[PDB]
Structure formats: structure tokens, C-alpha cells
Amino acid sequence: MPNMNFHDRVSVTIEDHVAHVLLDRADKMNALDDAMFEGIVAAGHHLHSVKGVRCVVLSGAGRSFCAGLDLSSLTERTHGNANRAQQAAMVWRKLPMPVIAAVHGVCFGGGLQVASGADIRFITPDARLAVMEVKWGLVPDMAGYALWRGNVRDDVLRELTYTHREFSGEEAVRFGFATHVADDPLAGAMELARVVAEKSPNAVRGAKTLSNRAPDLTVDDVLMAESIAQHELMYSRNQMEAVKAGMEKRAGDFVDP
Amino acid sequence: MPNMNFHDRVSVTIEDHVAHVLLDRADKMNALDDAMFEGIVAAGHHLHSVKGVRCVVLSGAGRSFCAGLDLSSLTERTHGNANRAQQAAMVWRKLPMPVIAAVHGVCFGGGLQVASGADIRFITPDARLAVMEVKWGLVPDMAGYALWRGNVRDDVLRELTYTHREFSGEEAVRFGFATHVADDPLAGAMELARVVAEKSPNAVRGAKTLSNRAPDLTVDDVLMAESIAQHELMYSRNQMEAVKAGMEKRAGDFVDP
Amino acid sequence: MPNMNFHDRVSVTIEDHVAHVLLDRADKMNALDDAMFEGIVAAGHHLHSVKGVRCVVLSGAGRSFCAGLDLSSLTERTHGNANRAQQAAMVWRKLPMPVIAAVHGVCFGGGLQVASGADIRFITPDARLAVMEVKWGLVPDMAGYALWRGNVRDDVLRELTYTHREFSGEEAVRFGFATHVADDPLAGAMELARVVAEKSPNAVRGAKTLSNRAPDLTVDDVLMAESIAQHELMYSRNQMEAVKAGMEKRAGDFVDP
């Protein structure tokens, strides 16, 4: 408590530095209508400014993560570098803290892109996924081409996009669309989020930022960005605490930004 | 019919929106002489402007896909961003429609790069491949460094290039040089090409273009290119048809660009 | 003989065109103190200008490759695009010839980044590795984000960095932190280095340079850099020798740059 609800579509609860974001339209398999878009983007935006949130778990209520877009202009940048549909996925990558998704049942189209905004994905072996867009005469346009490219082979992605074929959770892990197969992906994500929540929050945030930016920089610039990030951390209060806690084999007690 | 023949080296036949391109110099294991280069580049160029071709299958006549270069200036850009040797591989990636290669027997050097121009590769388990160039005191210069990098690990590629060692079709799939192991790679490629040929041709083409360009763009630019591509598709005639055919569980009837 | 020793921390010996670089502070598990940094960077620098070195093997004395940083400004570029800590890893990637690392025991933090500067890594199945930095409230800043990105998935790297968890040599190969599992990684690296040492040294060096630069170039520029590199090799003396030796089924006899 509180259960924070956005647009009757997304619920957020926070405990012990972990936020759990739940797509909550179980009766329509969390399909992406207008209010679900608003709900997702608003939930992620809210989380920018909650103090002390160190990790996010993102999952779906009911039987599926997200059945994709609901049947019932694009180029305008309404959310910084994104449009609204793209932000539903991108807000997770732009959050300063890591996002761990837990995927079960169907995860199609927009739903697969939204999950792909997370840092890391747990999934059931028997989940059903698809890069569904070509079926509707469209292309993936909710940031998939920016999010998939560091995890999925070029050939695999072209195939799955042109055929829009379904693949399982097990295949998803092997293809790079998910990170770990688990019978209870929510339990695995929550365990991992707890672990993340024990670490220096500044260091975790700096790492996320480097992971986010390094693919698009030249080697020279990666090197400078590493050194600039390390300069904010070295000899700071939470860094000296990490070392001390390290040395005393205890958990660090950190100040949250 | 017609069997279109280019320079007595490459044959192209088209049926039900699928073009089959056959390297046809079986008696020299489709080795890359001057006429084979001309033949390949001319065949790919011809296919730019054939209306209604929705997928290409690329394969070799006789016992091997391509034994590589035939024993018996480089920097000049004769084919847009490529020289002639590079275009033999690059023409497949620059074609608006997907190219599916089917690889068997030997596939060495230039032959491996030509195959690597395709979107997707089927291969026999017992094929023999090699990044052969270092053996001749050369480097791979027929676009391999542009084509391999989204499918093959950095470490794997440096090793195979420096040692020029042979690897099997099974290894090729695991390393990322091919997509699927099949006893009859041509039959698998043709099946996949048929599937591709059922889809909205505009959507398939937009997807290929995003897959082609997204690795070299910043995140910001990937996002804009996604939205710009989607804007050409949404509410167009073939997109409305895809949705309708989708809804009526039937095959779409599309107008070819 | 000679055993060249740098700062009492690194030993280098050269035979039959292979340099063996040994981190030699076995009694502190080759941990990275001030002198070890100096030792590494000086050893790599020396190797730039030794004529006839065609491959390098990098390994650790005693029980571990490198236990990482020793407890007992960052942004200044002291070694071209790197600071000193980054150069301990980067010098291996900037050397004109390939570097093959052999990893056993513990390989943590800085030690993992140093190994990651090599082109290719052999490792024991039961090695212990970790992206350790978050434990000390830091981020990886010894070039890991530039070196890991062509071998390791985005999701895997974010996980291992945030949790700083230990993973085995077997896992390392599957994750992309190492290339081959071997019970005797030094014996495997030395065998591979011998093979590399038989090849045209100009061709091997050109290949390393393309592998190094191609990830950061546009497709257009990769194509030009391939053609420019090939132009230095084609019809040169060592290239004509490779072909001849090729044709006569013998080892090439090359002039070293």
C-alpha cells in the first residue's frame, strides 16, 4: 500500500527499494489500447522521481504479459526522442534504475517491444512470442530496432519479422529476446531485483547509463564516458561505504539519490 | 521459363513472386572469375526492377555453393558505395526484397561473403566454409566486415580470419555465418521464401530497410526512422488489406510496388 | 632468453615469432597495483616495436590470471585515447599483431578487462570470473564497455555488472567473455599463436585493423576501409609469396614489417 493506479491500466507498488509495475487489464490480455499506452508511460514517468527506488519489476496480470495492440501523427516527437508508442517501451530504458521484466503467456507485437525496454527478461519456457507487425502490414515501430540490436542476431531478427512467426520462451532465450527461462519468472525477477537493490545505487545507475550509451559511441568516446562516470563515483560517500561494507562482509547502507 | 542467363554464369527464374538465382558454373564449383562477378552483379541489378518479386532464393548449381575466387583499381567506387567485388555480395542486401541463401558443399572466401549478402542462410550440416583470404595474403574485402558484424562475435571472426580454418555447416550456424542447418537447404529456403511472399510486400520491404539501417544509426535516429517507415504503411491500401485478410483468416491480396 | 622484466611485475619472452607475456606477481594473484599497471602498459608498448613478433600470448603466473585491483585524475588522456588503467587492457587491442589470452583461476574486475583486451581467450572450465566493480561502488572503467560489446549480449552484460556475480569459465564461453574452454588454456593459446605466426604478417595485421575499426564505421566506410587495406596487400611481396606457398603446399617465407 498504496497501490498506485494509472488510467485503470497499470498498477505500481513499491517496497524495500523495489517497484513492481503490473500491466493490469487482465481481462483483455493487457492489450494496448489508448489508456494502456497512457498508463504505461505515466507509470514510468512517475518512477523517475520517486526517491529510493533501486530496481523495477515489470510484469502482466492474469494469463499473459501483453497481447499487443488493440484494433479499436507518428513522426512527431512527443516524449523527447520518442512518440507515445515508442515511450511505452523506451521509458524503461530511460529510467535511471534497472528494469527486470517477467514474461508469461502471450507477448506479441507491441507487448514484445514493451518487454524489450527492460534491462533483463525472465520468461516461462512455454510463453508465446512474436514480432507480429508484418501480419497487420506494419513494421515494428515501438523501439524494437533500437532495443533488439544488442541482444538478437541480424539474421534471426529479419526472419522473425518477415514471417511474424510465433516462438516459445525457450527459443526466446536462445534468440536473445529474453535472458532466462524460469517456471516462475516473477519469482526470479523479484529475487534478482532484491539483489540489485542491495548495491550502491549510484554505481548501478552509472552502469546502466554506460550500457545504454556505449553501443552508439566510438571506442574513443566509450573510454571517456567510462572515465567521466567513474569520476563521479570514486571517493564519494556511497563508494567509500561499498568498500567498507565489502571489507566487513556486510550489506552497504547507502544514501539514495 | 524464361531461364534468364547472365554472362553464362548466373541463371534466374521467377515464379509465384519468388526469384530463384542459381550460380551456374558447376563444373568449376561456381568459382569467381571475371564473368561470374559480372553475372552476379547483373542478376541482382535486374531484380531491382522486376515487378512483383517478393523474395529471392540464392543457391549454387552442382556440388558446391562457391569455391571462392579464381586465381586466373580496388578503391574506386563503381557500384554506389561498393566496388564490383563488394557488389557481388552487397547487391543482395541493397535489393528491396529479402534474399534467402541456400548453402551446400564448399563455400570459401568470396563465396562465403556472397552468401553473407543474403538476409538469411540455410546450410547443410556437412558444408565446408572458410574465411579463406589470409591464406592468399589478403583480407576479406567483399563486404564481410559489413555483413558479418551483426551475426558473428568479434572474437570468433578474428580467429577464423587469422587461421583461415575450415568450419562445418553446423559450426556455421552456431557461429552466426548461417541461420539454419538443413539436409536440404534449398527446400528449406524455398519454403521460407514462399511464406515471405504471402506477406504485405511494402511491410516486408520497410522491415528490411530498418534491419539494414538501424545498426549504424543512433537510438534517436532509429526511433525516427521507425516512425517514418510506419507512416508510409499505416492506412495505405496494402496495410488495410493485411488487416482485413488477418481478420477473415485468409491470405492478403496485395498490389506489388 | 632474455626474460624481459618490466617493473618486477610482467615478464616477456619471444621465440619463433611468438611473444609470451606473463603477469608475474603470483604471490598476490597478479593483483593490479601501481607497478602492475606500469608493468603491463610498458610491456605492451615495448612490443609495438619488436621486429618479427607475429602473435602474442598473454597469461598469469601461479594460480590465477588476475585477482583485479589492489585496495592499497581519471579523465586525463595519458595514453592516446586511454588513461593508464584503460591502456592496460587497450594496449593489447592497439598492438598491430593478434593477442591470445589464456585464463585460469580467478579473473575479476580489472583482471577481466585486461584479458578482454586480447583478440581471443582460452579459459579453464572452472575459472572464476566476475564484472566485480559494482561491489566497490564503482563501474567498469578499464575499457570493458568498448571491448565486451562485440562479444557479449546487452542483457547479459547489464545483469553481470549490476549483480557482480561470479561465473565459471564454461559460462564465460557461452556469454562471450571467452572464446574456448580448455583444460590447458596456455597450451591451446600457444598452439593457436603458432598457427597465426605462419601466416602473412601484413594480412594478419590488416585483418586485425578491420576487426578493430569496422564496428564503429558506417557500412559505406567499412567498404572503403576494406578496399584500402586490400590495396596495400594485393601484388605486394608477402602476398605473392602467400599465393606461391599456397600453390606449392608449403609454408610461406615472409618478410616481417
Side-chain angles (χ1 to χ4, degrees), chain A residues 1-68 70 72-257, chain B residues 1-68 70 72-257, chain C residues 1-68 70 72-257:
Chain A
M1 286 324 150
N3 174 282
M4 311 192 271
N5 185 263
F6 300 76
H7 293 90
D8 221 61
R9 294 257 108 98
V10 181
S11 304
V12 182
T13 62
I14 299 163
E15 178 154 67
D16 305 322
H17 307 280
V18 172
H20 182 203
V21 175
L22 187 71
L23 309 186
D24 204 339
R25 194 201 170 191
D27 57 292
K28 305 294 310 206
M29 288 200 281
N30 305 316
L32 296 169
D33 56 8
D34 184 21
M36 181 69 80
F37 281 112
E38 290 297 328
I40 293 170
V41 159
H45 177 71
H46 186 74
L47 286 165
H48 262 92
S49 75
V50 176
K51 216 155 166 301
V53 174
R54 295 183 190 180
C55 202
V56 174
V57 175
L58 175 60
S59 74
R63 309 184 78 263
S64 293
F65 182 80
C66 178
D70 189 308
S72 352
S73 91
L74 282 148
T75 56
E76 198 192 330
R77 302 298 91 182
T78 41
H79 294 77
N81 61 3
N83 65 24
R84 182 186 67 175
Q86 288 169 336
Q87 183 72 356
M90 284 299 301
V91 64
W92 314 106
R93 183 64 48 101
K94 295 166 172 178
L95 282 168
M97 79 287 295
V99 178
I100 303 172
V103 181
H104 76 291
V106 168
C107 182
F108 280 177
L112 177 56
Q113 292 175 86
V114 168
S116 296
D119 293 70
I120 291 147
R121 288 151 289 284
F122 289 71
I123 194 158
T124 43
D126 58 350
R128 295 164 60 201
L129 295 78
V131 180
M132 198 49 102
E133 289 73 5
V134 169
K135 186 192 200 222
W136 312 120
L138 292 171
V139 297
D141 76 326
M142 286 174 49
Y145 291 94
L147 294 165
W148 295 323
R149 58 186 182 171
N151 286 326
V152 184
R153 286 155 54 161
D154 178 83
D155 62 350
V156 171
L157 176 59
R158 294 170 182 265
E159 177 171 345
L160 294 172
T161 303
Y162 305 154
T163 64
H164 69 74
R165 76 148 184 107
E166 272 180 33
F167 53 106
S168 76
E170 312 226 84
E171 285 172 309
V173 174
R174 273 184 43 241
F175 292 162
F177 293 93
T179 317
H180 297 286
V181 173
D183 283 353
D184 185 353
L186 186 62
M190 283 287 346
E191 179 51 33
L192 178 64
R194 191 192 63 74
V195 171
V196 172
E198 287 160 353
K199 317 302 183 193
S200 174
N202 318 79
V204 172
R205 293 175 178 222
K208 184 168 186 188
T209 300
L210 292 168
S211 277
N212 288 350
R213 303 165 71 204
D216 288 343
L217 292 175
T218 59
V219 165
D220 292 4
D221 294 347
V222 177
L223 297 182
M224 194 46 84
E226 287 177 0
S227 289
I228 289 175
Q230 194 76 299
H231 183 267
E232 314 320 297
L233 301 167
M234 180 76 87
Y235 312 130
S236 73
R237 198 264 164 203
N238 284 339
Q239 194 273 312
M240 304 203 290
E241 170 68 13
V243 173
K244 202 145 72 288
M247 285 184 322
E248 305 176 26
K249 306 212 111 52
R250 24 167 287 256
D253 169 61
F254 304 110
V255 175
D256 288 283
Chain B
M1 286 324 150
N3 174 282
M4 311 192 271
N5 185 263
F6 300 76
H7 293 90
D8 221 61
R9 294 257 108 98
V10 181
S11 304
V12 182
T13 62
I14 299 163
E15 178 154 67
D16 305 322
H17 307 280
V18 172
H20 182 203
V21 175
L22 187 71
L23 309 186
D24 204 339
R25 194 201 170 191
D27 57 292
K28 305 294 310 206
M29 288 200 281
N30 305 316
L32 296 169
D33 56 8
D34 184 21
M36 181 69 80
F37 281 112
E38 290 297 328
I40 293 170
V41 159
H45 177 71
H46 186 74
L47 286 165
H48 262 92
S49 75
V50 176
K51 216 155 166 301
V53 174
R54 295 183 190 180
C55 202
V56 174
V57 175
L58 175 60
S59 74
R63 309 184 78 263
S64 293
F65 182 80
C66 178
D70 189 308
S72 352
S73 91
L74 282 148
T75 56
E76 198 192 330
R77 302 298 91 182
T78 41
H79 294 77
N81 61 3
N83 65 24
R84 182 186 67 175
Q86 288 169 336
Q87 183 72 356
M90 284 299 301
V91 64
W92 314 106
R93 183 64 48 101
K94 295 166 172 178
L95 282 168
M97 79 287 295
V99 178
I100 303 172
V103 181
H104 76 291
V106 168
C107 182
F108 280 177
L112 177 56
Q113 292 175 86
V114 168
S116 296
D119 293 70
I120 291 147
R121 288 151 289 284
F122 289 71
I123 194 158
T124 43
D126 58 350
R128 295 164 60 201
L129 295 78
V131 180
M132 198 49 102
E133 289 73 5
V134 169
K135 186 192 200 222
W136 312 120
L138 292 171
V139 297
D141 76 326
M142 286 174 49
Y145 291 94
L147 294 165
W148 295 323
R149 58 186 182 171
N151 286 326
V152 184
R153 286 155 54 161
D154 178 83
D155 62 350
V156 171
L157 176 59
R158 294 170 182 265
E159 177 171 345
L160 294 172
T161 303
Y162 305 154
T163 64
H164 69 74
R165 76 148 184 107
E166 272 180 33
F167 53 106
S168 76
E170 312 226 84
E171 285 172 309
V173 174
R174 273 184 43 241
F175 292 162
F177 293 93
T179 317
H180 297 286
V181 173
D183 283 353
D184 185 353
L186 186 62
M190 283 287 346
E191 179 51 33
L192 178 64
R194 191 192 63 74
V195 171
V196 172
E198 287 160 353
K199 317 302 183 193
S200 174
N202 318 79
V204 172
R205 293 175 178 222
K208 184 168 186 188
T209 300
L210 292 168
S211 277
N212 288 350
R213 303 165 71 204
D216 288 343
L217 292 175
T218 59
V219 165
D220 292 4
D221 294 347
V222 177
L223 297 182
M224 194 46 84
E226 287 177 0
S227 289
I228 289 175
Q230 194 76 299
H231 183 267
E232 314 320 297
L233 301 167
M234 180 76 87
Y235 312 130
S236 73
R237 198 264 164 203
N238 284 339
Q239 194 273 312
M240 304 203 290
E241 170 68 13
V243 173
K244 202 145 72 288
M247 285 184 322
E248 305 176 26
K249 306 212 111 52
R250 24 167 287 256
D253 169 61
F254 304 110
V255 175
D256 288 283
Chain C
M1 286 324 150
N3 174 282
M4 311 192 271
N5 185 263
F6 300 76
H7 293 90
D8 221 61
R9 294 257 108 98
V10 181
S11 304
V12 182
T13 62
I14 299 163
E15 178 154 67
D16 305 322
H17 307 280
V18 172
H20 182 203
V21 175
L22 187 71
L23 309 186
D24 204 339
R25 194 201 170 191
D27 57 292
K28 305 294 310 206
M29 288 200 281
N30 305 316
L32 296 169
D33 56 8
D34 184 21
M36 181 69 80
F37 281 112
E38 290 297 328
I40 293 170
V41 159
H45 177 71
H46 186 74
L47 286 165
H48 262 92
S49 75
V50 176
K51 216 155 166 301
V53 174
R54 295 183 190 180
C55 202
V56 174
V57 175
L58 175 60
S59 74
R63 309 184 78 263
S64 293
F65 182 80
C66 178
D70 189 308
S72 352
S73 91
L74 282 148
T75 56
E76 198 192 330
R77 302 298 91 182
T78 41
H79 294 77
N81 61 3
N83 65 24
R84 182 186 67 175
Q86 288 169 336
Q87 183 72 356
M90 284 299 301
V91 64
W92 314 106
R93 183 64 48 101
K94 295 166 172 178
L95 282 168
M97 79 287 295
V99 178
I100 303 172
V103 181
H104 76 291
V106 168
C107 182
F108 280 177
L112 177 56
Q113 292 175 86
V114 168
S116 296
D119 293 70
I120 291 147
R121 288 151 289 284
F122 289 71
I123 194 158
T124 43
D126 58 350
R128 295 164 60 201
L129 295 78
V131 180
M132 198 49 102
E133 289 73 5
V134 169
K135 186 192 200 222
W136 312 120
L138 292 171
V139 297
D141 76 326
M142 286 174 49
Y145 291 94
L147 294 165
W148 295 323
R149 58 186 182 171
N151 286 326
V152 184
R153 286 155 54 161
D154 178 83
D155 62 350
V156 171
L157 176 59
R158 294 170 182 265
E159 177 171 345
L160 294 172
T161 303
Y162 305 154
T163 64
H164 69 74
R165 76 148 184 107
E166 272 180 33
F167 53 106
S168 76
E170 312 226 84
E171 285 172 309
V173 174
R174 273 184 43 241
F175 292 162
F177 293 93
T179 317
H180 297 286
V181 173
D183 283 353
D184 185 353
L186 186 62
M190 283 287 346
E191 179 51 33
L192 178 64
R194 191 192 63 74
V195 171
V196 172
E198 287 160 353
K199 317 302 183 193
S200 174
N202 318 79
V204 172
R205 293 175 178 222
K208 184 168 186 188
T209 300
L210 292 168
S211 277
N212 288 350
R213 303 165 71 204
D216 288 343
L217 292 175
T218 59
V219 165
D220 292 4
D221 294 347
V222 177
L223 297 182
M224 194 46 84
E226 287 177 0
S227 289
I228 289 175
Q230 194 76 299
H231 183 267
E232 314 320 297
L233 301 167
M234 180 76 87
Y235 312 130
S236 73
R237 198 264 164 203
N238 284 339
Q239 194 273 312
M240 304 203 290
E241 170 68 13
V243 173
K244 202 145 72 288
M247 285 184 322
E248 305 176 26
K249 306 212 111 52
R250 24 167 287 256
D253 169 61
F254 304 110
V255 175
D256 288 283

